[PDB]
């Protein structure tokens, strides 16, 4: 078998995911009225609306070697030159030194030229341009997303558009939010699209919107707003959650959520809203399902469920429970007082509540300490390799990088293994003494498509930039992941390919049956007579920490 390759692009920042941090676990339990039970937490339905938008812009530069900037394209040029004929006007207008100025392509004359598809781009992010003073016209199709407020929508490039995607004039959408002058927007009725790759023209009309931002022109199809779905969505069904009362506020804790919620001790009147049919129905249905799964044989329900609004925008549904052993103590004590109703009886017998408070207290503290141990370790690995940590946290291969203290994320494009080829050598002939640290690769996004140049990354990743170069060494030997198996390289030359099952695996935590042997270092004689560094494998943490120390010494020498 062979795994699919991935060409992960660099995220621009359209999607930023903050990540949780450690907490202050109490040294000794202090919460009152401890109790276990089932819970279902609901998150605010952000209602993400995704759509594709076309971006237009031009580039202008001076041939003397200066003054390079970007500017948008007017509306008439997009709907007449580009839409009707797929061509861009040669002349371009811009502001230079706070003064109106113009330019032309090679200063030839006022003419028109057709647009051509981008050389590499992506199959899902098609783009076009007029050329691979100088003027260039560029048109690109990118994705866009909007949230419940629908006041702004972010493009795939990371730039926000302060305007509602549903704004228009066809269906009285003038009331929609907008932050641009009336002269900066235009809507066309009966508009027909034209795929520049084929120029076959659209088959049916689609009203098109057009906006001109200070840096580019954006256009998207105006679609009526869909009916609003339920305002809340099930975030996660908690199998077990402990509730504690302290400081006039409840405290909910779990082992899987890794977060503590706080409420005002008053049940939110869910009945006040007619959405109970969406939340009350889904919530109650989950309580019985979880209860029948494991609590039907050992626990008993205590009254009807409860709903509370927690800090951060979460709605927590609750169903307090108590073990059969604790139930025996309550009924036994109740019989003494008599000389069946668990509600309005729990927390009454202080002597019976004293041991359970301490018992459940250790469980809550244990989860908090364990979660802090995992959170601090997870956060460190996240900074060390956001690609692997981001991919596992979402269940699919994903690209990500840290934009300071927040992590930007984007999706990766997969490519089949039969569409990639690896070069036979990793040495660069342009300059001796330097060679690529990883094998070079050439591939195509799809079968029969154009070939592109790139470099092999980690975990079948395909890098579009060939920059992983390093001073070369003697006795080189490395294994690189390539599809299902591995590709072996020695002395910066392709040797052969081997499968995944041809190498010893240590899947288990501890394996003492490794038939290892005392390796004897064998260095070529050129290391002594020519003083050329010998191979040392990838840099260990101390090696990189020690390697930069030498750089400081070299700088001091200089």
């Amino acid at each position: 078998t062979d795994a699919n390759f991935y060409v992960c692009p660099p995220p621009t920042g359209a999607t930023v995911v903050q990540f949780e941090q450690p907490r202050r676990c109490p040294t000794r339990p202090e919460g009152q009225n401890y109790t276990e039970g089932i819970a279902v937490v609901f998150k605010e339905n952000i209602a993400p609306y995704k759509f594709k938008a076309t971006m237009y812009y031009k580039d202008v530069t001076v041939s003397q070697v200066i003054f390079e900037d970007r500017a948008p394209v007017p509306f008439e040029e997009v709907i007449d030159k580009i839409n009707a004929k797929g061509v861009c006007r040669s002349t371009a207008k811009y502001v230079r030194n706070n003064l109106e100025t113009t330019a032309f392509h090679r200063d030839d004359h006022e003419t028109d030229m057709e647009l051509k598809p981008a050389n590499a781009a992506t199959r899902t992010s098609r783009g076009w341009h007029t050329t691979d003073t100088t003027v260039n016209c560029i048109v690109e199709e990118v994705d866009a997303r909007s949230v419940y407020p629908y006041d702004e929508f972010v493009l795939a490039t990371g730039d926000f558009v302060y305007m509602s995607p549903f704004y228009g004039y066809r269906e009285g959408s003038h009331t929609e939010h907008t932050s641009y002058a009336a002269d900066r927007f235009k809507q066309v009725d009966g508009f027909y699209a034209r795929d520049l790759t084929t120029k076959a023209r659209a088959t049916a009309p689609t009203t098109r919107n057009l906006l001109t931002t200070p840096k580019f022109t954006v256009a998207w199809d105006w679609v009526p707003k869909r009916p609003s779905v339920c305002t809340m969505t099930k975030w996660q069904e908690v199998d077990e959650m402990l509730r504690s009362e302290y400081g006039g506020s409840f405290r909910f804790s779990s082992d899987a959520i890794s977060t503590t919620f706080t409420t005002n001790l008053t049940e939110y009147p869910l009945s006040r809203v007619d959405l109970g049919d969406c939340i009350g129905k889904d919530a109650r249905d989950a309580m019985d399902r979880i209860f029948a799964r494991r609590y039907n044989a050992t626990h008993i329900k205590v009254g009807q469920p409860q709903y509370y609004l927690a800090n951060g925008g979460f709605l927590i549904a609750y169903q307090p429970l108590l073990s059969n052993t604790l139930a025996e103590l309550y009924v036994r004590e109740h019989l003494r007082e008599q000389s069946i109703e668990f509600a309005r009886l729990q927390f009454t017998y202080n002597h019976i509540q004293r041991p359970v408070n301490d018992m459940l207290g250790r469980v809550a503290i244990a989860w908090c300490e364990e979660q802090n141990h995992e959170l601090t370790l997870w956060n460190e690995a996240r900074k060390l390799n956001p690609n692997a940590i981001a991919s596992v946290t979402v269940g699919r291969r994903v690209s990500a990088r840290m934009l300071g203290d927040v992590m930007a994320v984007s999706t990766c494009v997969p490519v089949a293994a039969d569409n990639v080829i690896v070069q036979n050598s990793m040495r660069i002939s342009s300059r001796p003494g330097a060679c690529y640290s990883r094998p070079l690769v050439s591939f195509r996004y799809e079968d029969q498509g154009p070939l592109v140049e790139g470099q092999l990354g980690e975990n079948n990743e395909l890098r579009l930039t060939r920059d992983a170069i390093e001073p070369c060494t003697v006795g080189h030997r490395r294994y690189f992941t390539f599809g299902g198996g591995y590709v072996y390289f020695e002395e910066y030359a392709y040797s052969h390919q081997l499968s995944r099952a041809d190498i010893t695996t240590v899947s288990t935590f501890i394996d003492l049956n490794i038939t290892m042997l005392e390796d004897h270092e064998f260095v070529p004689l050129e290391v002594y007579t020519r003083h050329e560094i010998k191979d040392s494998g990838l840099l260990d943490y101390t090696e990189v920490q020690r390697r930069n120390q030498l750089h400081d010494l070299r700088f001091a020498d200089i």
């Epitope: 049916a204 707003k225 869909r226």
Partner: antibody, heavy 115, light 107 residues
Framework: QVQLKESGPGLVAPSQSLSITCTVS????????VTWVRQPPGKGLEWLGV???????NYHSDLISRLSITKDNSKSQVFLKLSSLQADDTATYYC?????????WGQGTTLTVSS | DIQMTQSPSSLSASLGERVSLTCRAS??????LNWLQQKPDGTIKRLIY???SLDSGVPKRFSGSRSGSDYSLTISSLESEDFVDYYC?????????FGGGTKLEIK
Amino acid sequence: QVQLKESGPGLVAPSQSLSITCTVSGFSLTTYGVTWVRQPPGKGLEWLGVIWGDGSTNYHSDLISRLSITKDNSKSQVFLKLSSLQADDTATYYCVSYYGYFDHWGQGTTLTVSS
Amino acid sequence: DIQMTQSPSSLSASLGERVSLTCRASQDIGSSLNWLQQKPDGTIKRLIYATSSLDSGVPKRFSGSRSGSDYSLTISSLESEDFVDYYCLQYASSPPTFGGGTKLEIK
């Protein structure tokens, strides 16, 4: 300009599966959706479902178990399906586009369920 | 779901008389409300969309407005053809729901 026309059997037996096709022109189905509405004799209108530009669809809670809608973008036709038809299913079915919110409506087809 | 209540179920008026209808929503729907008209043969036509925005080509006599949680439709002068059915419709929350309907008859 936008127009919609329905096409169905007109008469069907109870407990069988219904099939109605609505031909629409004036807008692309790849971007806009189509909604279905019915009206029994002497009663008000009733919403059935809707199919947006994408493959997503929404159905009424009283007909989700039996209602099903599909489409073809090349032919600009939307197919309506309804299984396990009862006696009270006799009603005039209409297909209403989303070029607007409910701007254009079709003529409608009168369907009767009886053996 | 949002339930729409239309009143009156029926109305009596003379030719050229000024009448008005009202439709109330159980929950907030904003400006997302439309008024429809059905011909005797079953043809459905939209009159007002998005709360008081006259439809393309609709007669000027038709109109609409909002008053708090109540939405209304008004006809300046009634003609012999306007004596047909009318229905209020909402589309703010899923699923859209129609009103109870109103029939206009001669006085």
